[PDB]
Amino acid sequence: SDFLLKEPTEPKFKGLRLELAVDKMVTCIAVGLPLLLISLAFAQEISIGTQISCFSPSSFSWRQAAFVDSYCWAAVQQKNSLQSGNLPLWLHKFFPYILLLFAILLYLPPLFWRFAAAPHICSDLKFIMEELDKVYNRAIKAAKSAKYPIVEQYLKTKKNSNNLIIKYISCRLLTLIIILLACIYLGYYFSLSSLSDEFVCSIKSGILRNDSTVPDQFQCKLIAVGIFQLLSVINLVVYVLLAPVVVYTLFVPFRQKTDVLKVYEILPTFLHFKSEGYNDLSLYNLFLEENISEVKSYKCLKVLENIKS
- Residues preceding gaps in the chain (C to N > 2.5 Å): 83, 146, 270
For ligand LBN, which is the closer residue by CB, 208 or 241? 241
Residue 244 near which of ligand LBN, a copy of itself, none (CB within 5-8 Å, type-dependent): ligand LBN
Residue 109 near which of a copy of itself, ligand LBN, none (CB within 5-8 Å, type-dependent): ligand LBN
Contacting residues toward ligand LBN, per CB under 6 A: 20-22, 25, 28-29, 32-33, 36, 101, 104-105, 107-109, 112, 116, 166-167, 170, 174, 234, 237-238, 241-245, 247-248, 254-255, 257, 289-290
Residue 37: count of CB within 10 angstroms of its CB: 23
Residue 210 near which of ligand LBN, a copy of itself, none (CB within 5-8 Å, type-dependent): none
Residue 248 near which of a copy of itself, ligand LBN, none (CB within 5-8 Å, type-dependent): ligand LBN
**CB-based contact 94:230 (threshold 8 Å):** no
Enter the DSSP assignment of 257: -
Q: What type of residue sits at position 139?
A: A
The CB-of-222 to ligand LBN minimum distance in angstroms stands at 19
Enter the DSSP assignment of 58: T
In the complex, which residue's CB is closest to ligand LBN? Answer: 32
The CB-of-126 to ligand LBN minimum distance in angstroms stands at 18
Determine the 3-state secondary structure of 194 from DSSP: helix
For a copy of itself, which is the closer residue by CB, 179 or 295? 295
What is the rounded CA–CA span in Å between residue 52 and residue 69? 6
**CB-based contact 234:37 (threshold 8 Å):** yes
